Design a protein around this ligand. Structure first.
Ligand SMILES: CCCCCCCCCCCCCCCCCC(=O)OC[C@H](COP(=O)(O)OC[C@H](N)C(=O)O)OC(=O)CCCCCCCCCCCCCCCCC
Ligand SMILES: CCCCCCCC/C=C\CCCCCCCC(=O)O[C@@H](COC(=O)CCCCCCCCCCCCCCC)COP(=O)([O-])OCC[N+](C)(C)C
Ligand SMILES: CCOc1cc(CC(=O)N[C@@H](CC(C)C)c2ccccc2N2CCCCC2)ccc1C(=O)O
Ligand SMILES: Nc1ncnc2c1ncn2[C@@H]1O[C@H](COP(=O)(O)OP(=O)(O)OP(=O)(O)O)[C@@H](O)[C@H]1O
Lengths: 164, 361, 133, 292
């Protein structure tokens, strides 16, 4: 047995259809959960320049977008699915817009903590490296530990001053 | 071959961004399906009829339903085939007997004067239609022919009796009498005695009374229950607002038929704003009764779509007394005149009256 | 009405403004001339077979000429259609290139940008590689 | 012959149907050829009457208004903002009205021009169109590069044989990237910037500015780039103001445009506020409040 693990990748994957279909992804469409995610992902500026907004042909065989914009679509699609576990992968290294990231974080923190949904945010976000949220560090194909974030501070090498 | 596709390769070229179909998209305003047309003729087509022959098992009902020109063809074929089926019998019997040979009549012919199949055909006409010219008699020296004379008469009598019965049920057809029962093109909604109602005018053209008239009214609309049902064409009966509750009406002059819109009506929340063309609304009116001449019951079916309703209009007077009698001026049958009426729904009208009653007391 | 379009107006635009007159006429001239021979060879065979069934003569050279005329006309008709089809395809593409380049940018922004692409890749392919055949 | 009629009738109708669909392709292609527009001409003598190359850049707008859809719903109303000839002037608008109308009006790309313009003192409508855009450098928002030879990339129209472009290639920006291409000046492009420095678009204009004699400089917004890239633009602006003496920068980054003689903005379909100095923008803290 297994469950519907949510996923995102460094190389974004998109559906050459309407943007709303590229976000809902064969799932029921409710504006209540819909608006809580697009505003969180700050994709409205994209729909503020596109002619039909969500109905524009996003992806290949149609409208071509920017690298950061494709990252915005990919991260938005993961949240709407309402899955018991969620995996992200470099949504902040590919696009490093400060305002976009933190609005989703407040939406991410509220839902993921309350619903007890895992969020393995594989990224280089310096702001939230230490927190009450667990961290795991890897190097040369092995994980040092999977526990509290203060455990890194208990080591001599704190990731080279932790971007002091 | 003389075809461009005689030899072609496996072709695939990316027609990048094949967009803008520019489809007409005219299906939105194509048509609004009617439940029953303005002249009966229910506009409903059935599908997946798993017939087990019951279509034709009702032969005598089917024969009557057919149009008269078709009935004449069946009338003709049923008799021409019977005459010609026994024409082959008489021709063959006289062939086997041997009196068909063109020679001296040494024997006694099986059926006299049968010389050719033409004479065999004419003799078949004489026996079945009972003309009996007598040039072609039936002799006593043919025990087989006597049997066929019995068979042809019984089949001839049986065909006639069956065919007469079908014609009598077609002569008593009263679907043509139901076409002289007239309903106005558009029904109106106006205030009567302080209460809103859905008025309508129905008239009879012929001078022959239609006995035991009975008028029914139903609303055809899609209905969703609180439990979430999906009823596509729900029919809800409408009271006639008759003084005695019953549907019985006496049709001599064109009567006004109206439904008092009380709190128990399905039209209790109809506003003139929602009376446009593409509105899920229809009122079916069914006038029944037995025609005094043939005694056969009839129906006159008419329907009013939303775009065939006229809010806040009044039916013009039609009956005017003359010197020796009354007079119905049918030119003014469907004429409507505006009336001072609220533009609010029945619920708002009741609510406004409820608030006014409390303020007065 | 839009669907009902026999489209004889599009054929005239292709032939008159892109093919020419010398090449267009020889295409029509060869077709009528080729099938006139095709009737003749069959007709002359009928006369040969019917008359030779024993004035008259031996049809040992006339039938060759009709066949020789027919075989050569096949080469002429085949070359002319393909050569003319090449001329229309090449010069039409140059006209389209000289128009889009010398066109305002307002139309490019308004257009879906696939309408120009389709009429440039899919449509030009059918005109170039199918109409001559 | 009667035997062969069966398939002659079949393939007559069959080929006819297949031809009609393919004839529709001729209908659609010829429809695009019916888009007869972009009249390239000049309503005057264009040989010696206009300036050979605008150098002063004294363009004083006089009641010019631009609207695209048949001169309807204009975003500008009698635009008359005096730029500074012989010196740099950077006018940045918060919204698109400041730059979108200006960029089109500089190169006559705007669909409608209600009025007239004076390019270096000479009219704009009475000048060659190719020469109009040949000596007016401009940057765009998104990085746009083609795939072709560098020698035919920086100056394909000019086709300048001077090797200073190669010297400028390692001097203007991306000194190491020039060495990364073994060909150098004659090297071809590599997949149109699949893996290349983000300053390629700005560097391309640097070679274009020096080669095409682009005395007047135009600018636009920025999507995403390094902070030091803006600093490199500042040095080029100083050199442009010192040597070329004409510059018109349009963007929405207030601090970068602050290093300019003047600054303007057009808002709500007309001009919002013009300031002869740049500190006058900071004098009105309201516009600085909108910026940050
Ligand atoms: C998709 C296309 C479908 C087309 C379907 C229709 C096909 C029609 C065929 C046309 C030729 C028919 C000729 C018939 C001539 C007599 C009938 C006639 O004149 O009409 C008078 C009418 C029939 O009219 P209707 O409107 O069709 O009636 C339908 C009826 N109201 C109903 O629906 O209910 O009838 C009456 O009102 C009845 C009176 C009958 C009295 C006349 C006696 C004639 C007897 C037969 C004589 C001819 C014998 C020929 C023998 C030949 C032997 C070799
Ligand atoms: C509407 C209808 C009237 C039709 C009249 C006859 C039509 C055929 C004409 C014909 O040649 O008939 C022939 C029979 O023909 C047959 O026996 C035909 C049997 C076919 C069955 C009936 C038609 C279906 C008539 O010829 P015969 O009966 O052989 O004549 C006797 C010969 N003798 C005079 C020398 C003694
Ligand atoms: C769309 C293709 O679907 C078809 C498929 C078939 C079956 C078939 O053998 N086809 C090829 C034959 C081979 C040699 C290319 C063909 C294609 C075009 C014209 C004629 C033919 N030959 C047909 C058989 C007799 C000789 C000529 C028939 C007809 C069709 C059809 O258009 O309906
Ligand atoms: N399409 C149809 N056409 C005619 N009669 C039908 C049709 N569908 C159902 N009926 C009639 O409805 C009755 C049974 O309907 P229902 O569909 O509930 O059962 P059923 O399992 O299809 O019946 P059965 O096996 O007896 O035909 C029978 O009298 C059957 O003749």
């Amino acid at each position: 047995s297994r469950g519907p693990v949510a996923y995102a990748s460094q190389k974004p994957w998109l559906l050459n259809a309407t943007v709303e279909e590229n976000i809902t992804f064969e799932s029921p469409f409710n504006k209540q959960r819909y608006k809580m995610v697009i505003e969180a992902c700050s994709l409205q500026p994209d729909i503020d320049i596109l002619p039909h907004g969500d109905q524009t042909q996003i992806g290949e065989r149609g409208i071509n977008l920017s690298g950061g914009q494709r990252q915005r679509i990919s991260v938005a699609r993961a949240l709407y699915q309402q899955t018991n576990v969620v995996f992200l992968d470099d949504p902040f290294s590919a696009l490093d817009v400060h305002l976009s990231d933190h609005l989703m974080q407040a939406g991410i923190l509220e839902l993921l903590r309350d619903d007890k949904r895992t969020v393995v945010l594989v990224t280089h976000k310096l702001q939230y490296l230490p927190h009450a949220d667990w961290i795991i560090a890897m190097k040369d194909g092995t994980i040092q530990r999977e526990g509290t974030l203060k455990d890194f501070q208990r080591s001599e090498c704190q990731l080279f001053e932790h971007w002091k | 071959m003389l075809s461009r596709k005689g030899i072609i390769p496996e072709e695939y070229v990316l027609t990048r961004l094949a967009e803008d179909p520019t489809e007409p998209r005219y299906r939105t305003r194509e048509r609004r399906a009617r439940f029953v047309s303005k002249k009966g003729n229910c506009n409903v087509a059935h599908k997946n009829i798993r017939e087990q022959g019951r279509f034709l098992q009702d032969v005598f009902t089917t024969l009557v339903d057919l149009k008269w020109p078709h009935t004449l063809l069946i009338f003709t074929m049923s008799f021409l085939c019977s005459w010609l089926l026994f024409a082959m019998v008489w021709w063959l019997i006289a062939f086997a007997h041997g009196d068909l040979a063109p020679g001296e009549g040494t024997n006694v012919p099986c059926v006299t004067s049968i010389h050719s199949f033409s004479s065999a055909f004419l003799f078949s006409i004489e026996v079945q239609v009972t003309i009996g010219f007598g040039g072609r008699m039936v002799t006593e020296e043919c025990p087989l022919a006597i049997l066929i004379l019995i068979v042809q008469n019984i089949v001839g009598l049986m065909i006639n009796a069956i065919m007469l019965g079908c014609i009598f049920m077609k002569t008593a057809q009263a679907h043509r009498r139901a076409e002289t029962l007239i309903f106005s093109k558009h029904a109106v909604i106006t205030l009567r005695h302080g209460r809103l109602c859905f008025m309508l005018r129905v008239g009879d053209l012929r001078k022959s009374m239609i006995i035991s008239a009975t008028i029914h009214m139903q609303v055809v609309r899609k209905t969703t229950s609180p439990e979430g049902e999906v009823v596509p064409l729900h029919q809800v009966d409408i009271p006639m607002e008759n003084g005695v509750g019953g549907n019985s009406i006496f049709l001599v002059a064109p009567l006004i038929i109206y439904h008092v819109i009380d709190s128990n009506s399905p039209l209790y929340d109809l506003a003139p704003s929602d009376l446009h063309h593409h509105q899920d609304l229809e009122i079916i009116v069914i006038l029944e009764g037995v025609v005094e001449t043939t005694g056969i019951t009839t129906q006159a079916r008419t329907s009013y779509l939303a775009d065939e309703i006229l809010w806040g209009q009044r039916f013009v007077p039609i009956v005017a007394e003359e010197d020796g009698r009354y007079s119905v001026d049918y030119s003014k049958f469907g004429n409507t005149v505006k009336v001072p009426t609220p533009l609010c729904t029945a619920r708002q009208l009741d609510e406004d009256r409820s608030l006014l009653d409390a303020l007065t007391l | 009405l839009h669907q009902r379009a026999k489209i004889p107006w599009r054929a005239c635009t292709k032939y008159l403004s892109s093919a020419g007159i010398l090449l267009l006429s020889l295409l029509v001239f060869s077709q009528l001339l080729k099938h006139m021979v095709l009737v003749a060879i069959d007709y002359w065979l009928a006369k040969w077979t019917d008359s030779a069934l024993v004035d008259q003569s031996v049809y040992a050279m006339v039938f060759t000429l009709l066949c020789s005329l027919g075989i050569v006309l096949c080469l002429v008709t085949s070359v002319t259609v393909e050569w003319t089809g090449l001329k229309v395809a090449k010069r039409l593409h140059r006209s389209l290139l000289n128009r889009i380049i010398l066109a305002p940018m307002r139309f490019f922004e308004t257009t879906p940008l696939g309408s120009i692409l389709n009429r440039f890749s899919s449509d030009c392919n059918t005109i170039d590689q199918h109409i001559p055949s | 012959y009667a035997l062969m009629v069966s398939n002659y009738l079949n393939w007559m109708v069959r080929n006819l149907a297949d031809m009609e669909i393919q004839l529709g392709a001729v209908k659609r292609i010829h429809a695009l050829l019916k888009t007869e527009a972009e009249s390239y001409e000049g309503l005057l003598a264009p040989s010696l009457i206009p300036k050979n190359w605008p150098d002063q850049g004294k363009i004083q707008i006089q009641n010019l208004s631009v609207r695209y859809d048949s001169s309807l719903k204009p975003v500008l109303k009698h635009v008359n903002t005096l730029i500074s000839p012989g010196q740099k002037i950077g006018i940045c608008g918060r919204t698109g009205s400041g730059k979108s109308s200006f960029s089109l009006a500089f190169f006559r790309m705007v669909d409608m021009f209600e009025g007239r313009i004076i390019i270096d003192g000479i009219d704009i409508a009475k000048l060659p169109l190719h020469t109009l855009r040949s000596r007016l450098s401009i940057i765009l928002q998104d990085p746009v590069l083609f795939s072709g030879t560098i020698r035919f990339n920086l100056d394909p129209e000019k086709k300048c044989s001077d090797s200073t472009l190669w010297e400028a290639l390692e001097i203007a920006q991306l000194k190491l990237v020039v060495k990364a291409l073994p060909g150098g000046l004659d090297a071809i492009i590599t997949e149109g910037g699949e893996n290349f420095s983000q300053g390629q678009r700005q560097l391309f204009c640097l070679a274009r500015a020096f080669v095409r004699k682009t005395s007047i400089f135009i600018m636009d917004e920025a999507t995403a780039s390094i902070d030091m890239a803006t600093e490199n633009i500042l040095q080029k602006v100083v050199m442009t103001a010192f040597a070329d003496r004409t510059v018109v920068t349009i963007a929405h980054r207030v601090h970068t445009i602050l290093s300019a003689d003047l600054v303007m903005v057009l808002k709500r379909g007309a001009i919002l506020e013009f300031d002869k100095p740049e500190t006058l923008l900071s004098q009105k803290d309201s516009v600085f409040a909108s910026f940050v």
